[PDB]
Ligand binder design. Structure first.
Ligand SMILES: [K+]
Ligand SMILES: [K+]
Ligand SMILES: [K+]
Ligand SMILES: [Mg+2]
Ligand SMILES: [Mg+2]
Ligand SMILES: [Mg+2]
Ligand SMILES: [Mg+2]
Ligand SMILES: [Mg+2]
Lengths: 54, 56, 291, 147, 95
RNA sequence: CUCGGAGCAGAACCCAACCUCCGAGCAGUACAUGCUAAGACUUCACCAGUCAAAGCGAACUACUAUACUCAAUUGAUCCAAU
């Protein structure tokens, strides 16, 4: 099929991917009582340490 | 309280990993040898009863 | 310009400001409440009988006899040894670049804790088990300054950022006494004590500071060229030849492992009043301070 | 100048010299000049950034010709119409780490091609279904009555 | 609680608290589960996993523990390689 | 004097009496009753308790196989033993 796109149709080959809906999480609360420590990771964008103003 | 039937024993892995798990056995039966999953070696291995923990 | 000029010409036509016409700003003086009168008297907000009104309710944390929350939870060593844990104030490359751009830290001279503290770049608390500064990678993408900087800890990516721009980074240990002195030298000089020697790292930290990967100050200089080249390869930049730089001598300036300050040796007494330096000549003293 | 018993000269007498630690070793696998490195923001706004490294695989002379031909087959899905092998990493906030990831992928590609591993890898689940489907497609294949 | 000590006239910490709870700088308190080392032979795997979790306290308990500890225990610490470093700061928290 | 089922309490939940009845303080089979993790339930607080997709690792192409049958079948912290 790459030959058809590149040679016959004279175009770049379109590639597609099956994308799943983003996972659901309930609204984050200030005191997540009785939830495990990993609760906080569910609402974290990045995995690399942050240092704020410092 | 007086009644007594089973006992709790420590089953120790024969793989030398030191992994142990506790199981219940009848007091009047012979020492247990069981095939149980050992996380250290990550596959099922033989376990042999070593000590009685308590009376159940 | 309706503010400054309108507020002062309008004062010309008002009575003189005196001790008889002053008042606090509204909202700064909340009223005081007294147990007098119908509203606030009688039981005076204490309720009726019980321990409440009499002032004898149990201690904080007591739950009426039920095994309290703060006791029925099992003990666990979350905070075990907290007071003996080493701490390092983070210094980001963003903050370091910011300080250089504003003239608060001078990149033309070696940068150590003293210069960082004097520029009010970082605040170190030796009494709170701070052992110095840790250079963190935040801001590496936009860090452009060429510096010779001495820190206590440095991340691999932070080291790469310093050395891609042609700078030099070294990791240097300071014991608690030395750290206090190097951070606030003037208070130390007013004690009239000879400059002490900097102690060696504890045994558990000797591997860190004797390793070229961390640019340890006790590491073999012959191993630095390879370590510097590895980071250049890993992060896709060309290692500059700093030997050809005009600031090469400054970039190489490093403290002796027993030296707290550049140009000052252990056992010297600083006479600030007379702006002099006293050096001991006794052989036994010189052996002690040089060992 | 102050020198104590723990001076680097005394600790490492063989490594003396002001230039010892600052020399660049003369004796270079991936030439950065030959790579086109671009930086953008991945879905940014998403916190992580993106680094892209693209080079013309066939023209690249720093890769052995047999290695060039085996990479083109294995990673045909990463080669565009112009013939440039495009690698992208967006796993970090820092452009440095993203570029380092892309460069390591190039080094892994060359290593895998040269290794020529004959070890039988474990079949993935998606591949298992395709194997059955390919088997039945061959089973429907016919031959001409009169060839 | 000792609100004013006889020697310093200062508030004191209840050390029973320090031995059981971790305070994250954002205000959250972490604890272990009661009974997580008790009679494991009679408890199911799912229950035992629940008992091993490190969990957060509620608002009321957090307020209580804050009162039972002095300011020293609420400062921002920079321990080297702290396992809990990431959890000291909240992210994407609304209201 | 703790725990479970039923009536009072007829239909979401909850609901008392020195109210009316019956029970529990185990047993049996497994030895992956391994690990891990979305989202939820909750005995009116807390503590405790309960159910779980996906995933890893197993089992598996005969086993209503995947959080065992079972209603309750139970005991915090400190401390002790190891
Ligand atoms: K009143
Ligand atoms: K009233
Ligand atoms: K503790
Ligand atoms: Mg009256
Ligand atoms: Mg009265
Ligand atoms: Mg009363
Ligand atoms: Mg509830
Ligand atoms: Mg599943």
């Amino acid at each position: 099929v790459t030959y058809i796109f590149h040679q016959l149709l004279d175009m770049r080959e379109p590639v597609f991917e099956f994308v799943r809906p983003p996972p659901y999480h309930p609204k984050q609360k200030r005191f997540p009582h009785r939830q495990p420590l990993r609760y906080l990771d569910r609402y974290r964008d990045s995995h690399e340490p942050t240092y704020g103003i410092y | 309280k007086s009644k007594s039937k089973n006992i709790l024993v420590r089953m120790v892995s024969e793989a030398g990993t030191g992994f142990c798990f506790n199981t219940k056995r009848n007091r009047l039966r012979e020492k247990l040898t069981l095939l149980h999953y050992d996380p250290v070696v990550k596959q099922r291995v033989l376990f042999v009863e070593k000590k009685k923990i308590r009376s159940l | 310009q309706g503010g400054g000029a309108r507020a002062l010409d309008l004062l010309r036509g008002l009575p003189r400001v005196s001790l008889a016409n002053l008042k606090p700003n509204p909202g700064s003086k909340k009223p005081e409440r007294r147990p007098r009168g119908r509203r606030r008297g009688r039981k005076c907000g204490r309720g009726h009988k019980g321990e409440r009104q009499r002032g004898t309710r149990p201690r904080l944390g007591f739950e009426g006899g039920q095994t309290p929350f703060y006791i029925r939870i099992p003990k666990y060593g979350f905070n075990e040894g907290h007071s003996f844990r080493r701490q390092y104030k983070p210094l980001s490359l963003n903050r370091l670049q910011y300080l250089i751009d504003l003239g608060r830290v001078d990149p033309s001279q070696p940068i150590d804790l003293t210069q960082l503290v004097n520029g009010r770049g970082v605040t170190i608390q030796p009494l709170k088990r701070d052992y110095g500064v840790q250079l963190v990678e935040e801001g590496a993408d936009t860090f452009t300054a060429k510096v010779n900087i001495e820190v206590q800890l440095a991340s691999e990516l932070a080291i790469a950022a310093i050395e891609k721009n042609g700078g030099v980074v070294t990791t240097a240990f300071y014991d608690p006494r030395s750290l206090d002195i190097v951070c606030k030298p003037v208070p130390f000089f007013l004690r009239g004590q000879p400059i002490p020697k900097r102690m060696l790292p504890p045994e558990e930290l000797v591997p860190y500071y004797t390793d070229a990967k961390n640019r340890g100050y006790l590491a073999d200089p012959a191993k630095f060229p390879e370590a510097r080249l590895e980071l250049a390869r890993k992060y896709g930049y060309i290692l500059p030849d700093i030997t050809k730089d005009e600031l090469f001598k400054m970039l190489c300036t490093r403290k002796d492992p027993r030296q707290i300050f550049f140009g000052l040796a252990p056992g010297w007494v600083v006479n600030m009043a007379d702006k002099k330096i006293l050096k001991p000549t006794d052989e036994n003293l010189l052996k002690y301070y040089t060992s | 100048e102050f020198k104590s018993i723990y001076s680097l000269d005394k600790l490492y007498p063989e490594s003396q010299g002001s230039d010892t630690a600052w020399r660049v070793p003369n004796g270079s696998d991936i030439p950065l000049d030959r790579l086109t490195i671009s930086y953008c923001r991945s879905s940014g706004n998403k916190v992580n950034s993106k680094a892209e490294v693209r080079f013309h695989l066939a023209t690249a002379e720093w890769i052995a010709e047999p290695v060039r031909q085996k990479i083109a087959i294995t990673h045909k899905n990463k080669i565009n119409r112009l013939g440039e092998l495009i690698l992208t990493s967006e796993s970090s906030r820092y452009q440095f780490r993203n570029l380092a990831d892309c460069l390591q992928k190039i080094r892994d590609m060359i290593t895998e091609a040269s290794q020529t591993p004959k070890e039988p890898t474990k079949e993935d689940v998606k591949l298992h279904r395709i194997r059955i489907e390919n088997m039945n497609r061959e089973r429907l294949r016919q031959k001409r009555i009169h060839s | 609680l000792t609100y004013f000590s006889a020697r310093k006239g200062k508030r004191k910490t209840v050390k029973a608290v320090i031995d059981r709870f971790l305070r994250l700088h954002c205000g959250l308190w972490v604890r272990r589960k009661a009974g997580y080392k008790k009679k494991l032979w009679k408890k199911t795997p799912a229950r035992k996993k629940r008992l091993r979790e490190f969990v957060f306290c509620n608002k009321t308990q957090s307020k209580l523990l804050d009162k039972m500890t002095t300011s020293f225990w609420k400062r921002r610490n920079w321990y080297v390689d702290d396992p809990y470093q990431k959890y000291h700061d909240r992210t994407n928290l609304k209201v």
